[model samples]
Target: KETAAAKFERQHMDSSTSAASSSNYCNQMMKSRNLTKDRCKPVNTFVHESLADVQAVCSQKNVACKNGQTNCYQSYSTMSITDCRETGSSKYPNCAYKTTQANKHIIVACEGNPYVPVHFDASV
Candidate 1:
């Protein structure tokens, strides 16, 4: 079974150096990464930072998560990331997306002995 920590990386981390291209980026990425298979994921965000960097966030001060959990931490540095939003015309199996890139201070919830992020809380 995959740990929540690993799943977080699979779903959110994208340390790629390439710049965001056309909306086609989301079309390819969302499908290639398996985000569109089940149903259109309404929105999916990808962080352009190393896994090590994201993991180190666990060492930061604990903060309240969106759902009121106290194990969340915010990244001390802002990072480049991209957001993929489903188009109004999108339907399951044809999950079209719009890509918009931005910089953000990411927040996440950590757990387990190794102390890594298990859930992506938000991007502020």
Candidate 2:
């Protein structure tokens, strides 16, 4: 079974390619990465940094989560990432997305025995 930490990596980590130059980047990646299986994920973020770098956020400063959870941590440095947002015209099974690339500090929720990222909270 895939753990929450492992699942977070699969959905949000993309160390291979940092550039989101193409307009269709989100459209392609969202489907290729299996995020569109049951239904289109309305909004998602993909970090283009090494897994070690992403995991290190667990030791960074703490922050208030949008959901009022106190288990979130904010990254200490800016990171390359792509934000995917579903287009208004997007229909289920043929969802369309808008891709935007930026460098920003990310916020994540960590848990478990080792205390690694379990969810991508937001990008600040």
Candidate 3:
């Protein structure tokens, strides 16, 4: 089974994807990255930073998770990220993604012994 830590790295961390030129970035990435395997992930954010920087977020200021969980944390500084959202016309096996990039203090849910990020709750 894929550990939450590994899953997080697979789905969210992409340091080299900082400069996706085409609007089809999400379209290409969502599939190539395996996020479009069984079904399209409705929304997801890719952090364009080193894995070390992302892991360090666990030690940043704590914040309430979107679901009111207490295990969330907010990044201390703005970070580069790409937001991928599914279009209304999107369908399974033919997923379409709208890609947008921004710099924001992201909020993420953490878990486990090391208390690293497990879910990207939101960006603020």
lDDT per residue, candidate 1, 68-97, as tens digits? 879999999887788898998898888899
Error of 3 at 56 (Å): 0.5
After best superposition, candidate 1 residue 63: deviation in angstroms? 1.7
The 10-residue segment of model 1 with minimum total lDDT is 16-25
* Model 2 spans > 4 angstroms off: none
Q: How many backbone clashes does every candidate have?
A: 0, 0, 0
Regions of candidate 1 where Cα sits further than 4 Å from its true position: none
Top lDDT model: 2
Candidate 1 residue-pair clash tally: 0
Candidate 2 on 18-88: residue-level lDDT in tens?
76868988999899888988999999999999999999999998998889989999999999999999998
Candidate 2's TM-score = 0.95
TM-score of each: 0.92, 0.95, 0.93
TM-score of model 1 (CA atoms)? 0.92
